[PDB]
Amino acid sequence: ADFKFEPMRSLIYVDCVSEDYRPKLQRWIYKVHIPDSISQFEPYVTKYAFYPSFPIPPQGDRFGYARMQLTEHHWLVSDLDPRLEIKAIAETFPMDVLVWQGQIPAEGNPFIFAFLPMWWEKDLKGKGRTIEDGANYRFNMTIGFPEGVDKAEGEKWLFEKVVPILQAAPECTRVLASAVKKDINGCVMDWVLEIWFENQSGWYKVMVDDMKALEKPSWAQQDAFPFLKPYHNVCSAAVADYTPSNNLANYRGYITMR
Amino acid sequence: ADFKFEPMRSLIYVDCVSEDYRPKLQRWIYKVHIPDSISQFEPYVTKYAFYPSFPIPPQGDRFGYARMQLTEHHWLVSDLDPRLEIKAIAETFPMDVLVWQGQIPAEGNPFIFAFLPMWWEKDLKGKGRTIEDGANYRFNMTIGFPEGVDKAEGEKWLFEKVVPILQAAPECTRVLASAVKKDINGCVMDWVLEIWFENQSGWYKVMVDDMKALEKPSWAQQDAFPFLKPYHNVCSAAVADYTPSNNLANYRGYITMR
Amino acid sequence: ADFKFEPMRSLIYVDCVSEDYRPKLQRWIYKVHIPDSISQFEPYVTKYAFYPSFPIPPQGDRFGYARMQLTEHHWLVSDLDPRLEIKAIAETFPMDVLVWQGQIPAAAEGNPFIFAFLPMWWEKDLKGKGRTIEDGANYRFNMTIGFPEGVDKAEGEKWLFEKVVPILQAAPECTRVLASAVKKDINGCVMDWVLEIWFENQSGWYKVMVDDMKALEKPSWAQQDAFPFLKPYHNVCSAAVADYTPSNNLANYRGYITMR
Amino acid sequence: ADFKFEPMRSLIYVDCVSEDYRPKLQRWIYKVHIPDSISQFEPYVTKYAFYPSFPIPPQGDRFGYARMQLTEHHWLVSDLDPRLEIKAIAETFPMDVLVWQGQIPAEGNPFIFAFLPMWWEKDLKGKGRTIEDGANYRFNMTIGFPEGVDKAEGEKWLFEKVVPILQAAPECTRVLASAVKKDINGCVMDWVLEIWFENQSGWYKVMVDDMKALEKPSWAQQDAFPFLKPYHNVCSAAVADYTPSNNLANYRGYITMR
Amino acid sequence: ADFKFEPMRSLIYVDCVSEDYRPKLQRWIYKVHIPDSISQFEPYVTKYAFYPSFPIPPQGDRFGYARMQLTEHHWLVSDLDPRLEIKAIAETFPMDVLVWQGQIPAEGNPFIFAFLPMWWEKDLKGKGRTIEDGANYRFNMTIGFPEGVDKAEGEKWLFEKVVPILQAAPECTRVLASAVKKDINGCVMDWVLEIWFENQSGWYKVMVDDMKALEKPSWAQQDAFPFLKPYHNVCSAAVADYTPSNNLANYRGYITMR
Amino acid sequence: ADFKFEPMRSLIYVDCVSEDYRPKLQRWIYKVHIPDSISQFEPYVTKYAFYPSFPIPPQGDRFGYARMQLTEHHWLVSDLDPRLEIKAIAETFPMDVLVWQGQIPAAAHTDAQIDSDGDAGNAARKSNNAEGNPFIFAFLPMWWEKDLKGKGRTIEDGANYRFNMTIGFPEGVDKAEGEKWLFEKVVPILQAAPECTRVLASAVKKDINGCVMDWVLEIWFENQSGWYKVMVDDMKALEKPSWAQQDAFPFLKPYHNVCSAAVADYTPSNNLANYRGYITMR
């Protein structure tokens, strides 16, 4: 009978693989997926928000850049408790939605649904920074090390090799990380970081030019950082501090422009 | 002392035993009861809603049909924890509310308030159905087998005898069930089912005529299905898929018509 | 490009001609028609609400009782301006809705869509001036009439206010009587008057609008034998409604959230 | 016939003549008045708000200081058009409210309900100031010259004698004024002004000490500025930039503390 | 004293001239502009909404493609009425914003703020279309014929040459147009059109490829359609059917992501 | 590790030490603090609310009367879990707020952010400057523990003057003796006063943030007059205990060992439901 109390913040990385698919995807998301979602989980989800992605930056393709948005949930219980499988009303969800997001063509790309605890486990740079300090270019990135790579070795590489370069860049204002909760849904990702910049240029200097300094790992799946396969072992997005799509509080139906 | 995380969904079957009582009962509910209620449980109830009952279908008097509404709470802790008995402000509660609901006559019917897990336990027909598939006539029935009936003999009857008639009838779109949490407020009921149709006529056809086929149990409290004493061992409502009285989000005070 | 300030309150009498249709009709209303309607007029309507019907009272059918709802708009401009015909997005409107509402039969006779415009404020207050919401719950009988073809309007008017109303006035069972003339200029609505007449309950409504009204002389223009002497759903429509509705749509709509 | 478009902002100056009345007056205002008011004008009043008064400063009694609030309305039609007299449901108004606000005595104070254009007619000091410039002590004052006093002679006094001193005082950051629309409801007041300060000390220095320099006019009803009979020909309140009681958008019923 | 009822819908084409300015401009718009704006016009503006631009399509540069948003207002009175110039709280508006939007440079582009009646004046293709007919790529374009060009010539060319190509394209689902109200704020534009396609490729086929057919007029400010100077004599944006930024209804302050 | 379920109601006694600070402190509260706060805890706080103070009554000073407001949070986890010390965006929280609330004396440089080693906010709410008054931030269970007078009173029974008071017994005073005193000498006088309509009490959850206070009580009246008649005039009857930090009841050092506010039944500042941004007056 007992359902465990399990506060988590989860992230889904939502791509759009053609600009021709965008109107339709965005339609589905806002006209259909929102009300289905709320209808199901209003009683045990405290927050449901979309953070629309900034335009893909140069070489964003290599970071598995989600060209549509990030979907953020805050959970009081595990969505993967199997007792939750049962829904009186199920979502409306055509095959097409996967085509649009890139999960299948018409291999594709996996669906990345990452669970984290609600507060960051590590604060590595920018402790104490307020909203009055200014507008942020928030690059959220999640990585998963390829098959047969020691998780401790990946971590050592991450925090003793990658992060230090972010700490050295004055153009990087904030670094946060949390370990992915793998027991929840067997997400392949192991880490979620958020790295902040003043703007797109800042982002480029650090994640492309500064990282050229890095040594190509033995397990490297691409040539340059992040050395992980785009959309499979690395997804990301750049977002603003604010989103008007805080959905449990603000959604009033699919109102159309006149 | 700790308070247990006990997420639940509860349902109250709120009758109205005379049309001349309707404006008064209804007034009290929407003008007084909502504010008192929200004031008390806002911090530990995630959803408070009323689902107004469709008008009483033929023979529904035999199923304990709640002529006013279904009342639905979603809890984070148990309302029956004795520490919750203390409140700064008690509900304003005129004794006439009990007359209006048929609790006393000015013999009377018991206050039915069933606790459940937030997710249905059994999914027996229509798995996969979405809102895109059309409007449902949702028939919510709760039952409690009489004193001195084996609960398992009754469980067995319910699911090996009754449910299959529902499964067989093309007029029924959906059958969900969940056992009543009996350890919370000694509710006399043992089960809650929601059984969907397309309309009142289909409900009648399946729940009256198809049910004729059932042999009458030895414990039967009336001659035909549900075989239980209306308002006492069976209550029910038929309701829409949508209610606009989702009270934590949409209550704006008792705004009077002009 | 000059638009008339034209504040008004309109009422639509929505019926549901069979219980089997109600789920489908109610769905459409709250799932489809609200958002389309809001999308269209949000900038020049200040309120937009539905008041569900209490269940149909006895002999309620002879009053053109709307078994679904009153739909109420407050406008700042006339919706029947021809410039307002054009809209980027048009209503999603299945033919079936006309079946559900009774406007056409299904495969015995079709009832018109009644859409009546009024001033925002009641024109005549004929009983119960000063009654507050503290005075108790109201059973609100909202009723619109339109005298049939060939009857002098002034004669009808005088009959309404010198014959019918004084019975409402006499009856202690009736707490309130309000009336307004229908703005007929706007959209040629067949109705001439709208009244709201209040009781404590259905029992009260019946005693007055049925039994007290038996004393009324049958008019020569009468379309049925007893008050209101007008053809149901064609020359009289009505509903009985509560003081409050949770369906104040501009303030309170959150999308079509489904029960679990 | 036509209803004229008439966009106006009204102010009402709500006193509370004793601290033992504050709980009852406030309860009536926020529990009964709001929803009676909203119910009536929701369709033709675009905004309805209360600005609680700041604690009455020294000598504020002499300015006819509202110890409850200012009550602001924005109208699209004149509330005084006779046809607006008729209303389904009447304001619930017990006589005590008059006692609480001092309309009827323990002599009475009149009820001061002044109509204005929605935009200030005169901007006399501090045009250009934004909210970024800091928190304002907003002293809203209405005055009405007494019977017999020539309206123009008074206007000239106000603008050529009184204002100049506000303009000299660097403690005052803003002076706005508008003639009262007398022709709506025969309000006795002639002008409403808002005069801003950093804080109470500032309001004092300027509106008491600096004003001692003015000569006492022949028509004076008291010895010191404002020279007008308190609560009868002069009312005021000091209020903050922001109120949480923007009622048309924020009221969600009389929810009570636990 | 009288104020004309002047219902109208207006549009601002908000560009953003470099991806490095986006965070800052976004922030200001949503953190500062919204609350300043609402404070000011809540009582006489019934709708205030932002529709963020879709990703600039190929050759959008040539259409004065606003890279940030359309800002949409619905007014009950004319903002240009000189009595509305007086405000108590002036908007916080550093000149930096004019740099982000491109009004001022490192040539300045003008600020295009076009007034219109609330309902489209010409329905030219696809009358009858509902939301159910599918998602729309909505291309809003405003054009101003350059100095010296007879205005009727301008119109004659628009509706006799340009629109028939839109009508001929099955890729184009809707054509709407309204004349700009010049008499309000001397906006240099003469027309606004919304032209719908299914997606970017449909938009490209018609607005770029099909238009090659048009004859270059004698006043052309650029070799190909729209034959007008970008951002000066033509602005445009492509937007979705829905926006979450319906600000009078949905703003709950500047909430930051966690 | 797991985060424990910990349903709690908490209160902060927010003072304003001079009227000239009021506009500034209010603006900061309403313009800056709310959004920062909501942003932080929206996913695990079910209710964030401000109950502004009624006017300070005669002799309120002696009860540590909070001249601005009560600040009420309802939590699903403990805000003092060390892991909640990490926040993407920290609170804009200048030192001025502490000057204005009386936590620290006036000085230059106070427009600056509070410099803490950990979080500026969590450490600001632990302020305990010798020359100021401490920051009183008391955690309670969500439901009142003891119901001592007035059980069953509804809102139809009338408007309430709700005097909310927290007290903590002085350094080295025996805690069980304080309790004994409170409930066998103080309460009885409340119970005897027909002018007191309600008495409610809960023990402060000390095991959370080290709050010095031991008790929170709410005591209802009809008005200032009745509040005074009972909390001042009736209370003269108490004997002065050996640990007394002032001559008269509550015998406790104001703003240090006693804090209080009187508030209404309703607030419009129920922040999770009602806040639409700092919308300014025209």
Ligand SMILES: [Cl-]
């Ligand atoms: Cl029987």
Ligand SMILES: [Cl-]
């Ligand atoms: Cl007949």
Ligand SMILES: [Cl-]
């Ligand atoms: Cl060119």
Ligand SMILES: [Cl-]
């Ligand atoms: Cl002392």
